[PDB]
Structure 1
Amino acid sequence: DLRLHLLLNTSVTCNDGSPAGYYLKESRGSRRWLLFLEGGWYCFNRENCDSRYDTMRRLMSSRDWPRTRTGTGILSSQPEENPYWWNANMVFIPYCSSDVWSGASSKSEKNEYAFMGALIIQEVVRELLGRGLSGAKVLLLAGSSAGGTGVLLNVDRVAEQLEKLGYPAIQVRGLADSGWFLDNKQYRHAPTEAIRRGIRYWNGVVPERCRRQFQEGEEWNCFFGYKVYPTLRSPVFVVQWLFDEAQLTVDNVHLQPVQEGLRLYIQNLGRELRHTLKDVPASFAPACLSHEIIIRSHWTDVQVKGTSLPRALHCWDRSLHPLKGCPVHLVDSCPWPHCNPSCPT
């Protein structure tokens, strides 16, 4: 179990002004630290955020959070469940800012909600330094869904934070799971509009090099993996199902008798996703219809070209010290959901 700590700086808050926080399980014989960002879509105006507060309040408030949480998947401390990093220090950061981890805006007389995702991550890192993070060799910032996009938006800022605090020896790296989306044409008739509105509502922040490329009014571009990833300097491993369920939801695709128009659409989606990963050297992209993987208990089951995801991440570790029989770039080439036999059922 990981144990809840609310942030000592109570000005860093969830949407409703309650303190943000993190769940921690220390491993004092290890210098590796895993900080995982929860996902769960987002909200981009008053009416939409009010609805979320009624029926998804744990993603907007800490007032009902449990004092413990079980570590699963890559957050499990058992070697059987987690061949990759079972002995690491484990941190789960709950997503209570509804801003894809980009916000830097407090609640005030002019704002009904606070959107402080980017500041929550920095404050977690600051308070963990006093609990052993100062001794680390590697800080892996991981996340799923909106938390996977959050990794892409924040990994270089964490690296800069530790450099300026006087810790140049901690190697900061990223693991983005199910956060690599396409701003493609929908199957039936726009999500880039919701992101563009959200960024204004949240006072959202994007990485500096990406911001300088796309400039004022176009920061929404940096929420899309294939556009922001080339601007990042920290090493980032990308996990993405080729037929991601959240991608298909926004594309208005609902799957059993598929006609030619939809067959071509689905095949073209997989081809385009495969193309955007061709120059990403650390990636794992199976031809499955699914969503999220790294904190699922059975994350060890899926394989690409005979290599599991825990193995691929171990090979990435070795590469950061190509390797015989230890691959790091794994992308399926077959063109239809479940053409890979190891896909989740």
Structure 2
Amino acid sequence: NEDLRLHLLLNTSVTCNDGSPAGYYLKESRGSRRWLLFLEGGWYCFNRENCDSRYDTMRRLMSSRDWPRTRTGTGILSSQPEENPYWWNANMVFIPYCSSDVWSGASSKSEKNEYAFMGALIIQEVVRELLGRGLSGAKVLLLAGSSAGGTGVLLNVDRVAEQLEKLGYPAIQVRGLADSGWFLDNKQYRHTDCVDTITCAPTEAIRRGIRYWNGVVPERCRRQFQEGEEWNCFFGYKVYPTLRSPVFVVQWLFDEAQLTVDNVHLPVQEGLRLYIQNLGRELRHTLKDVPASFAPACLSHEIIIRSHWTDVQVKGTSLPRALHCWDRSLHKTPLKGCPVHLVDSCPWPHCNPSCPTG
């Protein structure tokens, strides 16, 4: 079965980068009042030349022209109980990432602009269009995402909640699940002036991108940092405290993208060993006041739509279990025997034997 079926947006003015219509893949589950809306990741591009490169060799992330009519749901998007213990019977939606703007953009293609950056508008239009396919009667809408999509969750969840409330759907509980989108703007390991700006100078690439995209960040965070400093709101530990919606944060303690931006490659000598240990400690520190989180001591990247997402455990608790326990806590404290805060204490990648094998 290829249960996720493509729907191009009916408002064809809400577009991928090249002006083709954006869209979503849907598996309806008419017996369920739960909705999972998943935001795909895949970095971003921050100026014309950088986006032209991406257009040459990552065109599916910039255009719907060659999207397949169907997809197979994997991980948290699987309808098989064995693969997805959490939400196998839910209404599932996969929103392809074709805006290259960390889901923040609000700029149309025009004679001035070769590319459209409409990620923030794509999300709201998908939500409105799903109201006609069952969403209006929902109990829960979980906005989930991996990598740039995880950061997209942080940047968009409260706007989805506000839009639904304002449209007359107050009984839909809007929640977020941010996977591999919780980054540190930390000092890099033995920084050099390398030419891949996105990994060599992330805060500068994000600042530049936001201007190029007419990028939008959540209001309360925007108001804290003010004009020119909206890039701050792309960093989980900064934006998270400003959010009203419940958000479950999944983050490997040694996320491959974090290590890339930190100039780290894995004998490892003292300086790098201390660097890596401090990285894990800093990440754990940022998660201390997040109620519900899952952060294993592994070197990996993304998890929630991977088929083996059920395998990793922190202190004997899997991610699907944690997510279930989170659901129970929102009936915002955990229930006895049902942990929601699962962060490894060990200090080196793969000190947890249940880490993904690569």
- For Structure 1 versus Structure 2, the TM-score category normalised by the shorter chain is over 0.9
Post-superposition shift, 1:324?
1.2
Residue of structure 2 in register with 1:219 after alignment: 230
- d(CA) in 1 for partners of 2:271 and 2:292? 33
Listed one character per residue, the Cα deviations across residues 121-151 of structure 1 (whole Å, up to 9, x for unaligned) are 0000000000110110000000000000000
After TM superposition, give the deviation of residue 22 of structure 1 in Å: 0.2
Structure 2: stretches of 5+ with no match in the other structure:
192-200
Matched, 1:235 2:237: no
* In structure 1, distance between residues paired with 2:248 and 2:341: 9
Secondary structure, counterpart of 1:158 in structure 2: helix
Match in the other structure for 1:54: 56
- Residue 142 of structure 1: which of 134, 141, 144 is its match? 144
Q: In structure 2, what is the Cα distance between the partners aligned to 1:95 and 1:323?
A: 36
For 1:128 and 1:29, locate their aligned partners in 2 and report how far apart those are by CA, in whole Å. Answer: 16
**Alignment pair present for 1:2 and 2:4:** yes
SS at match of 2:133: coil
Where 1:130 maps in the other structure, the secondary structure is helix
Q: CA RMSD in A?
A: 0.5
Q: Secondary structure at the match of 1:5?
A: strand
Equivalence map 1:324-335=2 (5 Å): 324-335=336-347
Q: C-alpha distance in 2, partners of 1:292/1:304?
A: 16
The Cα shift of 1:317 comes to 0.4
1:257-292, Cα deviation, whole Å (9 max, x unpaired): 110010000001000000000011100000000000
Q: Distance in 1 between matches of 2:220 and 2:84?
A: 35
Q: Distance in 1 between matches of 2:4 and 2:282?
A: 39
Q: Return the offset for 1:314.
A: 0.3
Deviation at 1:254, TM superposition (A): 1.2
Partner of 2:202: 191
Q: Which moved more, 1:288-297 or 1:314-323?
A: 314-323
Give the Cα separation in 2 of the matches to 1:173 and 1:198.
27
Deviations 1:225-247 (A, max 9, x none): 00000000000000000000000
Partner SS, residue 233 of structure 2? helix
- How far residue 99 of structure 1 moved from its aligned partner, in angstroms, is 0.1
How many angstroms apart in 1 are the aligned matches of 2:13 and 2:29?
A: 29
**SS of corresponding position for 1:264:** helix
- After superposition, the C-alpha distances for 1:314-344 in whole angstroms (9 at most, x for unaligned) are 0000011131110001111110001111001
Distance 2:223 2:164 in 1: 23
Moved more, 320-329 or 305-314: 320-329
> Of 308, 311, 327, which residue of structure 1 is paired with 2:318?
308
Deviates more, 1:317-326 or 1:68-77: 317-326
* Superposition deviation, residue 109 in structure 1: 1.0
CA drift of 1:24 comes to 0.3
Correspondence for 2:287 among 242, 254, 277? 277
Instruction: Give distance in 2, aligned partners of 1:239 and 1:55.
Output: 29
Aligned to 1:320: 330
Structure 2 distance, partners of 1:272, 1:230, is: 17
Q: Distance in 2 between matches of 1:246 and 1:303?
A: 21
Secondary structure of 2:145 counterpart: strand
Measure, in 2, the Cα distance between the counterparts of 1:179 and 1:338: 20
Q: 1:283-311 deviations in whole A, cap 9, x for unaligned? A: 00000000000000000000001100000
Q: 1:191 Cα shift?
A: 1.1
Which blocks of at least 5 consecutive residues in structure 1 are unaligned? none
2: CA distance, partners of 1:274 / 1:318: 24
Question: Number of matched residues?
Answer: 344
Q: Distance in 2 between matches of 1:336 and 1:82?
A: 29
Equivalent positions of 1:17-166 (< 5 A) are 17-166=19-168
1:222 is paired with a residue of what secondary structure? helix
Give 1:188 shift.
Answer: 2.6
The CA distance in 1 between the partners of 2:202 and 2:271, in whole Å, is 22
CA deviation after TM superposition for structure 1 residue 10, in Å: 0.7
CA distance in 2, matches of 1:193, 1:41: 14
In the aligned structure 2, how far is the partner of 1:270 from the partner of 1:311? 23
